[PDB]
A paper describes a structure:
As wild-type SHP2 is presumed to sample the open conformation infrequently, we investigated an NS/leukemia-associated mutant, E76K. The oncogenic mutations of SHP2 (FL-E76D and FL-E76K) were characterized and found to shift the open/closed equilibrium toward the open species. The convergence of chemical shifts between WT and mutant proteins indicates that both forms close upon inhibitor binding. To confirm this hypothesis, we crystallized both SHP2 oncogenic driver mutants, E76K and E76D, with SHP099 and indeed found the closed structure of SHP2/inhibitor complex nearly identical to the FL-WT1. Consistent with our findings that FL-WT is primarily closed and FL-E76K primarily open, chemical shift changes upon SHP099 binding are larger for the mutant relative to WT. We further show that the SHP099 inhibitor binds via a pure conformational selection mechanism, associating only with the closed state, and, therefore, the oncogenic mutations vastly reduce the inhibitor affinity. Second, SHP099 dissociates faster from the mutant protein (koff = 0.10 ± 0.01 s−1). Stopped-flow kinetics of SHP099 with both wild-type and mutant SHP2 found that reduced affinity in FL-E76K arises from an inverted open/closed population, as well as an expedited koff. Indeed, the FL-E76K mutant experiences a significantly weakened inhibition profile for SHP099 with a >10-fold higher IC50. For example, in the case of E76K activity must be reduced by 98% to assure the same basal-level activity as for wild-type SHP2, which falls at the far tail of the inhibition curve.
The full-length, wild-type SHP2 (FL-WT) contains three domains: a protein tyrosine phosphatase domain (PTP) and two preceding Src homology 2 domains (N-SH2 and C-SH2). The binding of a phosphotyrosine peptide to the opposing face of the N-SH2 domain exposes the catalytic cleft to substrate and activates the system. In diseases caused by SHP2, mutations are often observed at the N-SH2/PTP interface (e.g., E76D/E76K), resulting in constitutively active protein and abnormal cellular proliferation. The recently developed inhibitor, SHP099, allosterically closes the protein and deactivates SHP2 by stabilizing the N-SH2/PTP interaction.
Author numbering: 2 to 34, 38 to 235, 244 to 293, 302 to 313, 324 to 527
Amino acid sequence: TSRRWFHPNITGVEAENLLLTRGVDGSFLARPSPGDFTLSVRRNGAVTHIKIQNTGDYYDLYGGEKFATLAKLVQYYMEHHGQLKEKNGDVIELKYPLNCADPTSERWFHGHLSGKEAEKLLTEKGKHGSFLVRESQSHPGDFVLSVRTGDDKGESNDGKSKVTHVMIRCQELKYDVGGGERFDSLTDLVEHYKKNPMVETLGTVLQLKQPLNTTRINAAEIESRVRELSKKQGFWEEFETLQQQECKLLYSRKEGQRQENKNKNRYKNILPFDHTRVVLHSDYINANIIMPEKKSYIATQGCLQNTVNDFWRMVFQENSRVIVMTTKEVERGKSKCVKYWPDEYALKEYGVMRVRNVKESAAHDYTLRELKLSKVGQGNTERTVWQYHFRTWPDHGVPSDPGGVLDFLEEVHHKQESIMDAGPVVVHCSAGIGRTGTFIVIDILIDIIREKGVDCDIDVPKTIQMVRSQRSGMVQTEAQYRFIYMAVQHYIETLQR
Ligand SMILES: CC1(N)CCN(c2cnc(-c3cccc(Cl)c3Cl)c(N)n2)CC1
């Protein structure tokens, strides 16, 4: 569970060179291509490149299956759960992950950074255990590990906290700390000294507890940050650093893997976490609760014809009053969601549930439907559910401008507020992770902003990671990540005007 097999800055020829020179039959590595990826596997003394497409909904292993994360794909195939057979029939077997040495995707690596800058950052934002690695300014080629140790966090003036700088020599492509073991990369060195902290001569234990947070920003300055991330790419490096931490979120999904529930998932290997699974009071639905660390969400898949009734049971049980569909019924020739709502003015029964379609309202980017949900046998249980069906989301990538999405979310939020103590807001697309995660993260950040104003801190990676711990693969592509950033920027600018 390390994910050292993903090389962010490698190309096809370099991957072939690595697999043949420093590898053996069974060695594999994943690499990024424009939005797609490649799994290069050594077999029979040669290399085979399998394409992995991710347009925004899921990872598509050509000749394989759909996955919410590259980590889960590699796990699925290494552990023999599935066999990556080729069109010929011969099995392509993953065996030995060829570890990468590039640290640009590590949370704690800040190349362009001086000693005084790093010490100032640690004094300001770091606490006990906060650490970072930087390039040595006095020794070109070597590095420096700056670690803080003390009692409290912040720029204290009592001598209880302090910053220590440990030199890291890079000799013959191997990293050491002036003596002892020589590690194959900065990552191995950092992990070793995380497990086995250094002890100073007088007792001080240099604990590498958490990396120094460099992503939390004040909203007012997002503009600058965006430019700082636009000058490889800033957005790309930050999103890849976020992806690197996906192997720490492979939680249990046994309920979705049950044989009774197989037919209730649109995609086989995209399942809900057990600890945030939506339980029905026939208890299974591919849905998860998303709770920001007041308004909660339900992230779920597009309805299957055999799950519409369970979907409406969920909406009723959870007392949800707002639904957000971010996909049309068919995309690029494939079906992504079954029509689960009645035609305008019509009334339809889904199992024990009943749904009237009172009125519809066609907007530029979306359609609003005022449905009335009730339970057959008791009319007192009639309630109004407002379905906001977004229709102008491109089949590939993300919108070019976030204004439509922002007004959409603003209306959704006002509607959710109009109903007192309303249940979670249901949000779904196809697999319920890509567009769903993007919309939910944007809604969370914009709610923070609207409540606390411009004078507040926002952390996009932290929010996305908190949401990913509740459903696998929330926010799928770097395009959606940059779109989140740009939508926050646009909302800040509109509020400032
Ligand atoms: C310059 C650099 N090499 C790439 C950007 N940078 C960072 C920092 N922190 C995060 C972060 C923040 C909160 C949660 C999670 Cl999970 C993550 Cl990963 C991040 N994604 N990138 C630092 C190193």
